[PDB]
Amino acid sequence: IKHTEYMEFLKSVPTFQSLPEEILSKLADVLEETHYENGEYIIRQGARGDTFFIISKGTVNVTREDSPSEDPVFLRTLGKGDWFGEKALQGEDVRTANVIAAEAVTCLVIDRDSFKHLIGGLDDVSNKAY
Numbered sequence: 001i002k003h004t005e006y007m008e009f010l011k012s013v014p015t016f017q018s019l020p021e022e023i024l025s026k027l028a029d030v031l032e033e034t035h036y037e038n039g040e041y042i043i044r045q046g047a048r049g050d051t052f053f054i055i056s057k058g059t060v061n062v063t064r065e066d067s068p069s070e071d072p073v074f075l076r077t078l079g080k081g082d083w084f085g086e087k088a089l090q091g092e093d094v095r096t097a098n099v100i101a102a103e104a105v106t107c108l109v110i111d112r113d114s115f116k117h118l119i120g121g122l123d124d125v126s127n128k129a130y
């Protein structure tokens with residue numbers, strides 16, 4: 001039943017609606033569901049990463065420490081259907097920002113092996129810029 005929940009969810013996200021359903025089925029087979037509570041760091045800037053995240057429940061805050069700043073600066077809030085964690089899967093594997101849960105959060109987490117085959121070629125992901 002979870003495979004179906006995942007498929008139905010992925011087919012509702014515009015970025016992933018562009019993917020053939022057999023590719024979505026393979027993502028649904030391999031993804032892992034992870035759960036967070038408010039204030040929990042999902043990603044820390046400076047860590048080395050290998051996973052991509054799609055928010056299926058809740059919201060997160062994104063912050064980043066820039067070289068000429070002392071303290072991390074708030075960037076944006078993401079919610080259900082949004083995704084993050086792609087930069088460490090594009091080239092160098094370093095995380096470039098913090099991502100912190102802002103309530104009860106569920107993420108669908110995709111590993112590097114699956115991302116590089118099934119997601120990384122999507123233009124919305126490969127050409128993402130902030």
Ligand SMILES: Nc1nc2c(nc(Br)n2[C@@H]2O[C@@H]3COP(=O)(O)O[C@H]3[C@H]2O)c(=O)[nH]1
Nearest residue numbers: 043062075084085086087088095096097130
């Ligand atoms: N550097 C940077 N990253 C942003 C930004 N907004 C988001 Br969401 N992010 C996401 O935060 C993630 C942290 O891990 P990552 O560097 O692997 O990918 C990042 C992006 O998906 C941004 O303005 N700058």
Ligand SMILES: [Ca+2]
Nearest residue numbers: 048049050093
């Ligand atoms: Ca790594």
Ligand SMILES: [Ca+2]
Nearest residue numbers: 121122123126
């Ligand atoms: Ca492409």
Ligand code: NA
Nearest residue numbers: 087088090092
């Ligand atoms: Na990178």
